Amino acid sequence: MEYKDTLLMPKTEFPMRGNLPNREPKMQEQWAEMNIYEKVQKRTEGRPLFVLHDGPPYANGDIGMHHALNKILKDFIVRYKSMSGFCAPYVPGWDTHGLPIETALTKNKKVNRKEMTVAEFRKLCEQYAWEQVNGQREQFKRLGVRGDWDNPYVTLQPQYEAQQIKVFGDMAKKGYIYKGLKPVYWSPSSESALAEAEIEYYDKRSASIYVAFNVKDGKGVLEQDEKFIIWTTTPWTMPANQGIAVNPELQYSVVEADGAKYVVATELIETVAKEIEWADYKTLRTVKGSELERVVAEHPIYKRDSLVVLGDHVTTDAGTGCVHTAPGHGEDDFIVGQKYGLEVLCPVDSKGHMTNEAPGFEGLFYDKANKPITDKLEEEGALLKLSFITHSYPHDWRTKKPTIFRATAQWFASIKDFREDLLKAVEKTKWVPTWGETRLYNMVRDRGDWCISRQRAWGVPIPVFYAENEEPIITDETIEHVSNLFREHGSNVWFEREAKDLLPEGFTHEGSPNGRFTKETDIMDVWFDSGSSHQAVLEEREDLQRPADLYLEGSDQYRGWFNSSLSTSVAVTGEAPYKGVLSHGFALDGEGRKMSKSLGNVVIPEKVMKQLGADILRLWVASVDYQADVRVSDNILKQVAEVYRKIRNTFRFLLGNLADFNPTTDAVAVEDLREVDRYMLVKLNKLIDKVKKSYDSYEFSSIYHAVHNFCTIDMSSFYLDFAKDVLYIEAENNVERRSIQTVLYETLLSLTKLVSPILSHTADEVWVHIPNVTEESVQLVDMPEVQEIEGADQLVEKWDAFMELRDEVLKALEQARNEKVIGKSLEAKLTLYPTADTKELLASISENVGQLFIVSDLEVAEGEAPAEAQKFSYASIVVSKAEGEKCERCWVVSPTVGEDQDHPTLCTRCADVVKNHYVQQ
Ligand SMILES: CC[C@H](C)[C@H](N)C(=O)NS(=O)(=O)NC[C@H]1O[C@@H](n2cnc3c(N)ncnc32)[C@H](O)[C@@H]1O
Ligand SMILES: CC[C@H](C)[C@H](N)C(=O)NS(=O)(=O)NC[C@H]1O[C@@H](n2cnc3c(N)ncnc32)[C@H](O)[C@@H]1O
Ligand SMILES: [Cl-]
Ligand SMILES: [Cl-]
Ligand SMILES: [Cl-]
Ligand SMILES: [Cl-]
Ligand SMILES: [Li+]
Ligand SMILES: [Li+]
Ligand code: NA
Ligand code: NA
Ligand code: NA
Ligand code: NA
Ligand SMILES: [Zn+2]
């Protein structure tokens, strides 16, 4: 009414309280209308490419917090590269085959794969897959991610399957593919073989056994009264035992008597005494381990032959220097078994039940047969001690049930034949974090061959044919024929055609004179499907190239996508499929616990997406060290939401005070700016350089705190706090108010372009309220390039000290606020007694110290009388009342109020502004 004369914050087109959940979906609607991803791609069509290949997430179900972090971090890098001189094509993917889909249907939808045909079950997997890829893609958009969502890649597409066969064919012609009977992971629950990437370790209770092996033919070294000692945590492997292993040269064994003479390593006398609980024991003689070679023993239950063999695998750390050798259930047992030509026995079927090869335990599940085996051992008297231990045990990654080693005929990729080239690729790759290099390097030098065949249906079949010779037929013509056939009809054709209909039209092989061929039924590892992405996406698609610039996935992908993609590429190309790798940790509860439904700590993305929004989650991603494990909770997200409030209010302050500003020609020159404003320009450019550098180094935690510090204390509390009472009161064409606005305009333009990769819904919302809009969205302009400011270093030293001094003045004002008598910074006059250094800085102030300290008046004298007021380490201060007339417009207590006849209640400053007008109004 009468007490106010406008001069407030006009531009409220950007609301204060951020209702992003109801506003962001509309923001994404316009993004889809304009096809912004195609626009930015077209704008940079000639710029150099930065390819961030997207790791294909599984379609097992809805998205989680971990799914968001992987996509959001990818979105940060792609958006920055788009507006920094690079062309950034990002095509999303989805891994569609393998157990993660079959187990989802079996458990969630209660469908039995054995109650329907193989073709029918595959069709249901295909239907459930496209349901999940549609649901996941919409959820990713809600978070806010830019990519080729309408043209993604999936592993079920015929082009992907066709190219995957080529990858197998290229490695096969190199000789890197072979088939053999070897012990490998077997999951009885899934009735299929597995690999380390498909193995999850959990603690499991197992029965420790110390058992006796009678001596039959000591070869002049041992008498029949001696007995071997064997330690085993797998009783079910005893029926398959074909030998005993002991170290030939390093370890020497001795005979110990406790009423009977036993054979054990000398270094394990005390350890085996406390385990079997021996009372009194004595050592008879010593024997070098190599002397015990070819000694024949007897099976405790079947009294069959068991041959003592030499091996480097037997260790002192075991419970006994003698380890029972079962070539059909162990890797090291198989190697020494083949050296001595020992028979391979696997009395366990695919479902985990003992077969006729174990006479007394046929039909029993291997874990259910442990007790009967021990009972028979004690009946035979060969059992010495029975104990129980808990240790980490391999489990199926989907059924969560334990796995066992089984010696079966499987397809393998000969890693050993090109392991050296794999190690070279790791050394030549840039790994962030740095330990990722050693993580994969050790995984390569210690890895065996890769078992690729899986006894399941939903996946890409192995393209191998067998003649009447039963010889595997792998050749370029067959691979070419099946690859093109898969490109036309898909992998489904292999499961619906005879063997002769999948081969070339006139193919004949020497092994089958009658032309009767047969095909293979096993399928490929789902990690091979994801590992073939570089050939099927980076190479086939024109929008991408190989090698990609960056691979950004989780820590579990070192054994997964990182390993498989490198394995396939180096086998074919010899080089890495990526120039660099970035790794993120695991999402965790606020207390550090794993996010699982059992703990009730699950943070659903859609839950936060509707309670808080998208950019709040985007801020949280940049607020954590993604390179390690990251903690998330509702309270933590609320803290990030509070940060967005500060960013919201500071942005609104910039927009509000820039309403009556048009920098088309009202731009104050750099020299014409106030020295206070020039320092803020240097700080803005320093912030620009730090953010762009941190984007190159992917350190988003630095960016998150830098912007928060740049606004909470530097801008809102220091620079905007002063201009909160100065900008509008003065003239609308005053150089001071225009110079301050030019700083605010440049910060608004630069900061909006800076935050564009991290926050985009709020960035474009602010970009709407921009006086100069030459591009539709902030994502269409490049990042602000840093510009040097003359005399920056001198001003930085001067004004940082001035910023330091102001905070001490404010603390003195807050000390007056503690008194609360004046209770106002502007209504307070000041009498300052400064240090010579402080006085020198005040002398260097060519601006108005009173308006900077938002005080009515300031006087400086060397009074040096502390009294009882205050003294900062650089000045003595007196906060005094002015006692003049308070201006009704600027609220400054000034003696000049009443000097103007037309406006007797206004000071000279306000009276002049009200009376005069520049050109208008
Ligand atoms: C699938 C069955 C569960 C694991 C069940 N809770 C269970 O068996 N629990 S346990 O504590 O008995 N597991 C001990 C492990 O050792 C085997 N075992 C148990 N009792 C004996 C025994 N007397 N002699 C030999 N082996 C034995 C079990 O099979 C299990 O692997
Ligand atoms: C590149 C993806 C792999 C080829 C595989 N399909 C896969 O892991 N698919 S996923 O859907 O399970 N996960 C996709 C991404 O999320 C990471 N991830 C999976 N689980 C977690 C977790 N608990 N915490 C943090 N990150 C996790 C994966 O490493 C991958 O980057
Ligand atoms: Cl099943
Ligand atoms: Cl063992
Ligand atoms: Cl047919
Ligand atoms: Cl067939
Ligand atoms: Li025990
Ligand atoms: Li709060
Ligand atoms: Na059924
Ligand atoms: Na099969
Ligand atoms: Na077969
Ligand atoms: Na995984
Ligand atoms: Zn006034």
PDB file of N, CA and C and ligand atoms in Angstrom, residues 102 106 111-114 121 189 191 456, ligand 3:
ATOM      1  N   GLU A 102      15.039 -67.276 -17.030  1.00  0.00           N
ATOM      2  CA  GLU A 102      14.358 -68.543 -16.781  1.00  0.00           C
ATOM      3  C   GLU A 102      13.954 -68.678 -15.318  1.00  0.00           C
ATOM      4  N   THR A 106      10.273 -69.137 -13.648  1.00  0.00           N
ATOM      5  CA  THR A 106      10.018 -70.341 -12.861  1.00  0.00           C
ATOM      6  C   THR A 106       9.512 -69.998 -11.465  1.00  0.00           C
ATOM      7  N   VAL A 111       5.912 -71.363 -13.416  1.00  0.00           N
ATOM      8  CA  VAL A 111       5.860 -72.150 -14.641  1.00  0.00           C
ATOM      9  C   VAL A 111       6.985 -73.172 -14.597  1.00  0.00           C
ATOM     10  N   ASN A 112       6.683 -74.395 -15.017  1.00  0.00           N
ATOM     11  CA  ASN A 112       7.654 -75.480 -15.013  1.00  0.00           C
ATOM     12  C   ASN A 112       8.165 -75.691 -16.434  1.00  0.00           C
ATOM     13  N   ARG A 113       9.476 -75.541 -16.619  1.00  0.00           N
ATOM     14  CA  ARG A 113      10.064 -75.687 -17.942  1.00  0.00           C
ATOM     15  C   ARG A 113       9.950 -77.115 -18.468  1.00  0.00           C
ATOM     16  N   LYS A 114       9.730 -78.095 -17.592  1.00  0.00           N
ATOM     17  CA  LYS A 114       9.586 -79.481 -18.014  1.00  0.00           C
ATOM     18  C   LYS A 114       8.139 -79.873 -18.283  1.00  0.00           C
ATOM     19  N   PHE A 121       8.644 -72.836 -23.998  1.00  0.00           N
ATOM     20  CA  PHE A 121       9.265 -72.151 -22.868  1.00  0.00           C
ATOM     21  C   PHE A 121      10.122 -70.980 -23.333  1.00  0.00           C
ATOM     22  N   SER A 189      20.714 -77.817  -8.999  1.00  0.00           N
ATOM     23  CA  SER A 189      19.410 -77.162  -9.015  1.00  0.00           C
ATOM     24  C   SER A 189      19.021 -76.739 -10.426  1.00  0.00           C
ATOM     25  N   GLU A 191      20.654 -77.950 -13.162  1.00  0.00           N
ATOM     26  CA  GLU A 191      21.022 -79.042 -14.063  1.00  0.00           C
ATOM     27  C   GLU A 191      21.855 -78.533 -15.238  1.00  0.00           C
ATOM     28  N   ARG A 456      21.012 -75.592 -20.943  1.00  0.00           N
ATOM     29  CA  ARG A 456      19.693 -74.975 -20.868  1.00  0.00           C
ATOM     30  C   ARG A 456      19.188 -74.642 -22.268  1.00  0.00           C
TER      31      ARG A 456
HETATM   32 CL    CL B   3      12.947 -75.233 -12.991  1.00  0.00          CL
END
